[PDB]
Amino acid sequence: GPIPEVLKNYMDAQYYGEIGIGTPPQCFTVVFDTGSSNLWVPSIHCKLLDIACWIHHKYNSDKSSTYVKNGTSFDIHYGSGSLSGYLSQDTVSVPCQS
Amino acid sequence: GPIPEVLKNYMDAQYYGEIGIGTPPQCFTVVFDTGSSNLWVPSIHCKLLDIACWIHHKYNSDKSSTYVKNGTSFDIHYGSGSLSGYLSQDTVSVPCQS
Amino acid sequence: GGVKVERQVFGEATKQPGITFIAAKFDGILGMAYPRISVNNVLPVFDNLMQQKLVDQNIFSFYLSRDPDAQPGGELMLGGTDSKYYKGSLSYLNVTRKAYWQVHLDQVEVASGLTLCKEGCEAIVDTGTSLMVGPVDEVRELQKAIGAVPLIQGEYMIPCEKVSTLPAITLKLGGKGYKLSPEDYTLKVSQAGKTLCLSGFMGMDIPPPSGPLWILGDVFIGRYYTVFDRDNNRVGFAEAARL
Amino acid sequence: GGVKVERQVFGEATKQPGITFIAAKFDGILGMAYPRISVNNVLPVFDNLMQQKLVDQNIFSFYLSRDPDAQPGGELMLGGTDSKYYKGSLSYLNVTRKAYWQVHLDQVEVASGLTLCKEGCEAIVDTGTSLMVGPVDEVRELQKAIGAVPLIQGEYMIPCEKVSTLPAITLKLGGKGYKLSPEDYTLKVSQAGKTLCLSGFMGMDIPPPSGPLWILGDVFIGRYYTVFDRDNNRVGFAEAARL
Ligand SMILES: COc1cc(Br)c(C(=O)N[C@@H](Cc2cccc(Oc3ccccc3)c2)[C@@H](O)CN(CCc2ccc(Cl)cc2Cl)C(=O)CCN2C(=O)c3ccccc3C2=O)cc1OC
Ligand SMILES: COc1cc(Br)c(C(=O)N[C@@H](Cc2cccc(Oc3ccccc3)c2)[C@@H](O)CN(CCc2ccc(Cl)cc2Cl)C(=O)CCN2C(=O)c3ccccc3C2=O)cc1OC
Ligand SMILES: *[C@@H]1O[C@H](CO)[C@@H](O[C@@H]2O[C@H](CO)[C@@H](O[C@@H]3O[C@H](CO[C@H]4O[C@H](CO)[C@@H](O)[C@H](O)[C@@H]4O)[C@@H](O)[C@H](O)[C@@H]3O)[C@H](O)[C@H]2NC(C)=O)[C@H](O)[C@H]1NC(C)=O
Ligand SMILES: *[C@@H]1O[C@H](CO)[C@@H](O[C@@H]2O[C@H](CO)[C@@H](O[C@@H]3O[C@H](CO[C@H]4O[C@H](CO)[C@@H](O)[C@H](O)[C@@H]4O)[C@@H](O)[C@H](O)[C@@H]3O)[C@H](O)[C@H]2NC(C)=O)[C@H](O)[C@H]1NC(C)=O
Numbered sequence: 158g159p160i161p162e163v164l165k166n167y168m169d170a171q172y173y174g175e176i177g178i179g180t181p182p183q184c185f186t187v188v189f190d191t192g193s194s195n196l197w198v199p200s201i202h203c204k205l206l207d208i209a210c211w212i213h214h215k216y217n218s219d220k221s222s223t224y225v226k227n228g229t230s231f232d233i234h235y236g237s238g239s240l241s242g243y244l245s246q247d248t249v250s251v252p253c254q255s
Numbered sequence: 256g257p258i259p260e261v262l263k264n265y266m267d268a269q270y271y272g273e274i275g276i277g278t279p280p281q282c283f284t285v286v287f288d289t290g291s292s293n294l295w296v297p298s299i300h301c302k303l304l305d306i307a308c309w310i311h312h313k314y315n316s317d318k319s320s321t322y323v324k325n326g327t328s329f330d331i332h333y334g335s336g337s338l339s340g341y342l343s344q345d346t347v348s349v350p351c352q353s
Numbered sequence: 354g355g356v357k358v359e360r361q362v363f364g365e366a367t368k369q370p371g372i373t374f375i376a377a378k379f380d381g382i383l384g385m386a387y388p389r390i391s392v393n394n395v396l397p398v399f400d401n402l403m404q405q406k407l408v409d410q411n412i413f414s415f416y417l418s419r420d421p422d423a424q425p426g427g428e429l430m431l432g433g434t435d436s437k438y439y440k441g442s443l444s445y446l447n448v449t450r451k452a453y454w455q456v457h458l459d460q461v462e463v464a465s466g467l468t469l470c471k472e473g474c475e476a477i478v479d480t481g482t483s484l485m486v487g488p489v490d491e492v493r494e495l496q497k498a499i500g501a502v503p504l505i506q507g508e509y510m511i512p513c514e515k516v517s518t519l520p521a522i523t524l525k526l527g528g529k530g531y532k533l534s535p536e537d538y539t540l541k542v543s544q545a546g547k548t549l550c551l552s553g554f555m556g557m558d559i560p561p562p563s564g565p566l567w568i569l570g571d572v573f574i575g576r577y578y579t580v581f582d583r584d585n586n587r588v589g590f591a592e593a594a595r596l
Numbered sequence: 597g598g599v600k601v602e603r604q605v606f607g608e609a610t611k612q613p614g615i616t617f618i619a620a621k622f623d624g625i626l627g628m629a630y631p632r633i634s635v636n637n638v639l640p641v642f643d644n645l646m647q648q649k650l651v652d653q654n655i656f657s658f659y660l661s662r663d664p665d666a667q668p669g670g671e672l673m674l675g676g677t678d679s680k681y682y683k684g685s686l687s688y689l690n691v692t693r694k695a696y697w698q699v700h701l702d703q704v705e706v707a708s709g710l711t712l713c714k715e716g717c718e719a720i721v722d723t724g725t726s727l728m729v730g731p732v733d734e735v736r737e738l739q740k741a742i743g744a745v746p747l748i749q750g751e752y753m754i755p756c757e758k759v760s761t762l763p764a765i766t767l768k769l770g771g772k773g774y775k776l777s778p779e780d781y782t783l784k785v786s787q788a789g790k791t792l793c794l795s796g797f798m799g800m801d802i803p804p805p806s807g808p809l810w811i812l813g814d815v816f817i818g819r820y821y822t823v824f825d826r827d828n829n830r831v832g833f834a835e836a837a838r839l
């Protein structure tokens with residue numbers, strides 16, 4: 158019945174688990190955040206030199222058979238930070254299940 | 256005769272090798288920089304929450320039998336960054352030799 | 354055995370300025386509040402999941418370990434509760450405003466006698482916030498009572514030798530007491546033999562339309578296993594299992 | 597078999613602001629220029645080493661690999677040269693100003709016909725700089741010739757399909773030509789199947805007392821094994837061994 162999702166705990170400051178986006182699933186670690194309602198991950202279309210882009214897992218639409226193009230710009234303003242990019246549509250797996 | 260010091264190469268952007276400071280030697284990776292003349296490493300007396308302090312190896316005077324207190328404030332201004340702290344005296348090993 | 358939420362609209366981030374996204378050990382954020390506060394009016398993951406009827410109970414629960422070294426670090430249960438991570442029985446509070454996971458907080462009492470949120474206030478249960486967040490003016494006074502010194506960005510420090518002798522903080526929710534001991538509301542940030550005790554209370558004023566709000570963060574959830582019910586729009590708490 | 601420089605005065609850093617020190621994979625910096633530019637007039641590591649007579653030859657040499665995956669990433673030889681990392685024989689230039697490892701650069705010529713540092717200029721050999729650095733105005737014109745687009749902080753980009761057809765850049769030092777091919781002066785920053793070609797030339801004006809200066813960085817040293825001689829205050833170059 159219920160789906161268990163294991164979380165990692167970094168220094169009691171950040172809790173995150175692994176999800177998948179695409180067919181075949183590409184793995185990303187996300188914060189299951191009850192203080193917000195959007196889902197986002199780094200894109201393959203981010204500047205390689207930008208510290209945040211390079212050090213994290215990037216989503217690549219071309220590797221997915223279930224990807225549906227959207228393209229609408231998005232901007233999110235959290236308590237601690239801001240990010241921008243664009244919208245896309247694909248299947249999300251919980252856990253990743255590669 | 257000559258002392259070989261192996262260097263790590265990170266993405267052709269940063270080359271660094273391992274040294275030791277203290278008796279017994281505490282290991283740190285440094286940039287053998289011909290564009291400057293000072294030697295410095297992170298202190299154990301830096302703010303744990305500061306990203307730069309936490310992620311790097313910190314020097315602890317109390318663990319060294321050859322440490323000689325100085326205390327003079329220092330400030331360095333490189334092309335890409337600035338740092339501050341205080342001066343200390345101890346033995347430097349090349350390579351670390353734990 | 355997992356779950357696959359098809360046709361899910363998400364963001365492909367191209368710009369992530371500031372140190373937050375360099376300090377983050379995770380890749381992104383999966384938002385789990387109501388469709389109401391969704392940017393670009395995108396249907397949330399749990400909402401699309403409920404619609405695809407992938408769960409029998411439209412609830413999700415969190416176990417957050419308060420020992421960084423403790424394995425697993427936590428557990429999110431989708432479509433149920435995990436009875437092996439909580440002690441006793443669940444206690445429920447209704448969601449006031451269905452945007453965040455907002456509840457009515459009756460008051461915050463310190464064992465020393467100090468009272469904050471004296472005549473009641475609004476609180477959100479936020480898994481993606483590590484600390485307890487309160488208004489700047491109320492938290493400054495709270496941190497005077499615990500004897501904590503100001504640090505930066507609304508955060509505070511306590512000398513670890515003083516932490517044990519601190520008073521208990523109690524949060525009144527659903528008429529029930531939710532006791533946090535000094536150990537529960539203070540983070541022991543240790544490394545290289547250096548230990549810095551950080552206050553689990555942070556001072557931040559959330560402006561309207563959103564606030565003012567108290568944020569019951571990982572400090573609270575780590576002590577009290579939380580249940581998020583979209584069927585009955587309520588929040589459940591039970592003392593979490595610990596060693 | 598190593599070396600132990602006793603009574604060495606160094607810095608214990610307590611504050612490291614900016615992204616540089618978060619982006620750095622190393623802990624600190626061991627400066628290897630002259631006592632002349634030492635902050636707080638602290639005796640340098642190589643200077644204290646020469647004084648303790650721990651080397652027979654008061655020279656240090658660098659091998660820097662230009663293949664990130666190539667092991668070792670480099671080699672610093674203290675008290676000699678490593679003949680197995682260089683091809684042929686060393687060519688020497690005298691140090692003009694004994695602060696940085698400064699030399700006279702006769703000119704910078706591009707195979708397309710473009711000339712920078714037309715009547716000679718001053719250059720430093722800097723292991724702690726990844727790129728070649730030139731004055732803002734001269735580098736902008738150079739990057740027009742290679743067809744590179746501006747990026748940020750004086751850096752540039754080239755579409756990788758164009759890199760092979762680019763002209764060779766030659767640096768005239770000691771009356772001798774020091775040829776860098778397009779592959780030698782362009783960094784292939786690859787990840788996740790995405791490749792971005794970055795120009796190995798950066799535009800930055802160094803102000804007096806220090807500059808203006810050209811900085812012969814890791815791009816140059818990686819191609820030409822460098823010898824730093826404190827006995828005869830000269831710099832040696834030899835084509836580095838590569839596969
Ligand atoms: C030190 O303690 C912390 C303090 C804070 Br303030 C956060 C934090 O920003 N949490 C975010 C999630 C997040 C995002 C990016 C990175 C994250 O993790 C890292 C953080 C730092 C370094 C590395 C990683 C976490 C939200 O869960 C907070 N919330 C809801 C409450 C809230 C509500 C309103 C307002 Cl003004 C402000 C807040 Cl804090 C949000 O960010 C809300 C965002 N938001 C909406 O979603 C929304 C919809 C419609 C209207 C307005 C809004 C709105 O403001 C985290 C903390 O530790 C983990
Ligand atoms: C993108 O390419 C790069 C560009 C630069 Br500009 C550097 C760089 O700053 N190198 C530093 C060493 C260093 C310090 C901190 C971090 C480092 O690595 C990282 C960098 C980024 C992110 C992560 C890690 C490297 C020096 O070797 C430069 N130099 C001498 C030349 C020079 C000379 C003069 C002036 Cl104004 C400016 C310069 Cl760039 C210095 O920093 C000189 C510092 N300096 C002295 O030592 C000194 C003594 C007396 C008077 C004045 C000075 C003086 O300015 C590095 C680069 O890639 C590696
Ligand atoms: C890219 O994906 C987007 C969705 O992720 C697409 O746009 C959105 O589509 C959804 C439905 O799939 C709409 O949601 C509905 O909104 C109504 C009304 O609420 C709001 O509507 C307007 C829209 O202009 C908004 O401005 C107001 O603030 C309203 O509050 C609800 O009643 C429904 O229940 C449902 O939530 C989104 O409104 C719509 N967004 C936008 C910005 O238009 C988009 O079409 C996709 N693009 C492509 C090219 O396929
Ligand atoms: C902490 O360690 C410091 C050294 O790392 C100590 O201070 C320095 O001590 C060295 C010698 O050990 C001095 O260096 C000499 O300087 C002279 C003259 O050059 C400069 O002198 C003055 C100093 O006030 C300076 O302001 C001028 O700009 C001169 O250029 C040279 O001729 C020598 O060859 C040698 O290099 C340093 O000058 C001195 N620094 C300072 C700031 O005084 C310090 O004493 C130690 N502290 C403790 C408490 O032990």
Ligand SMILES: *[C@@H]1O[C@H](CO)[C@@H](O)[C@H](O)[C@H]1NC(C)=O
Pocket residue numbers: 445446447527
């Ligand atoms: C929640 O609402 C239900 C009715 O749906 C009511 O029985 C219960 O007393 C309410 N509890 C709180 C804490 O608001």
Ligand SMILES: *[C@@H]1O[C@H](CO)[C@@H](O)[C@H](O)[C@H]1NC(C)=O
Pocket residue numbers: 688689690770
């Ligand atoms: C370097 O100086 C020596 C004298 O010490 C001289 O023989 C030689 O020609 C000079 N070379 C250069 C390139 O300046």
